[PDB]
Design a protein around this ligand. Structure first.
Ligand SMILES: CC1(C)CC(=O)C(SC[C@H](NC(=O)CC[C@H](N)C(=O)O)C(=O)NCC(=O)O)C(=O)C1
Ligand SMILES: CC1(C)CC(=O)C(SC[C@H](NC(=O)CC[C@H](N)C(=O)O)C(=O)NCC(=O)O)C(=O)C1
Lengths: 224, 220
């Protein structure tokens, strides 16, 4: 039975799942949930996922409500024995650790910045505060990449897919000029065919945020 | 060599690891990092974990910087064939999904509330706003418990360990009186021998928060 993905492509964690789906050529039914219209509070969706969040995957009787679980599940099912979710324990733990960095640190900070803009309007956000928090994330990722060309090791893993969608979102606002390894990695990611799955949603998010927040991102910032 | 855990027992994600260490009889070397003194920014610790967070586990050459990775790693190395981290794919994914709920939703919201107290003082926190956000988490967990005695199924898993430490922390402020499944589950968790590993740190957090936030929890 084909997996069903409830999605809003503006969302970075949704885009990571879209990227994996494209990378592994997985047949998935897409069901759109417009977050800015509050459709995630529809009684049926709420009953499916009380966290009212996307992505949400329905695959048979399995209901997953977090991009990182979805990434791992899809890797184990459509890339069984593969290197995206490595077979060797230490390597798999490294990937898991970076998936969790994306959730706990990078996404948390980007979400709190972007959500502030949605709630308060850009002109009323302490942008310098968020610049510091997100620059700190850039410095961390630069440190990770000083040892390897991918986030969790020498090969592409789920961690790269998870991190690149949020990094691309942070970089709508904050430039990467001071971060040579991060620039190299991001450019490499942009060369993947799977990266196309990031584009529509990133641009939609850009346009949506500028509308709701009443501002423009500096065009010079985004690496393209 | 044996695992080294950098820890501050006030931290909910530290306490889940302490619970697992007790549950599985794991021999670990503990190293205290006092977050309220900013010791997580000490040069050597920062070099080890640029996220300046606890728990951090060093196990040989493996450095883990997230409690959920630590729980999974320790279960895989020290509890092969156990039920805490089920080997059947669907069951494992359910546990993983709940671990990620704890990280992404429950802990995020509790951390935001508690940090607001630290930074603003309790008297200056929008408590109603946080009560709404955290009560929402209670509601969600009440739902998760509808078909089973534990968070991820009929048996105790890593998910319960991760969730109970944060839930016990939210419960410093907000009672479980309206949530019968959740209150039943929390009472059951408190009966586990391993839950003793949560006690010291929870109380230390209560005391630290009340001092730093210039207030007293209702539960105090
Ligand atoms: C403005 C912005 C960027 C704020 C956001 O946080 C997002 S992402 C959409 C959000 N999804 C999650 O929070 C899932 C995070 C999990 N850790 C994961 O799946 O990895 C969401 O569904 N929000 C809806 C809601 O909370 O009501 C965004 O898209 C907009
Ligand atoms: C005031 C309070 C409750 C705020 C907190 O957030 C904590 S928990 C300590 C914190 N640890 C993490 O943020 C790890 C979260 C990961 N997702 C995980 O391991 O599961 C921490 O180290 N903070 C220090 C810092 O950020 O500088 C707490 O203890 C105090």
């Amino acid at each position: 039975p084909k997996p069903i993905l409830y999605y809003d492509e503006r969302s970075p964690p949704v885009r990571s799942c879209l990227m994996l789906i494209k990378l592994l050529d997985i047949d998935v039914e897409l069901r759109f949930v417009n977050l800015f219209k509050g459709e995630q509070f529809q009684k049926d969706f709420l009953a499916l996922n009380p966290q009212h969040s996307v992505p949400t995957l329905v695959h048979g009787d399995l209901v997953l409500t977090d991009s990182h679980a979805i990434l791992i599940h899809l890797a184990e099912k459509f890339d069984e024995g593969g290197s995206l979710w490595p077979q060797e324990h230490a390597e798999r733990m490294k990937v898991l650790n970076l998936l969790l960095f994306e959730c706990s640190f990078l996404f948390r900070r980007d979400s709190d910045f972007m959500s502030a803009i949605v709630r308060q309007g850009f002109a009323n956000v302490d942008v310098a505060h968020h610049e510091r928090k997100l620059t700190e994330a850039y410095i961390i990722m630069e440190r990770y990449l000083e040892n390897s060309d991918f986030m969790a090791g020498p090969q592409l893993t789920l961690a790269d897919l998870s991190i690149v969608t949020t990094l691309s979102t942070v970089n709508l606002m904050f430039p990467l000029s001071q971060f040579p390894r991060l620039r190299r990695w991001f450019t490499a990611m942009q060369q993947l065919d799977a990266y196309e799955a990031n584009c529509s949603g990133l641009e939609k998010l850009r346009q949506t945020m500028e509308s709701v927040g009443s501002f423009q991102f500096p065009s010079s910032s985004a690496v393209v």
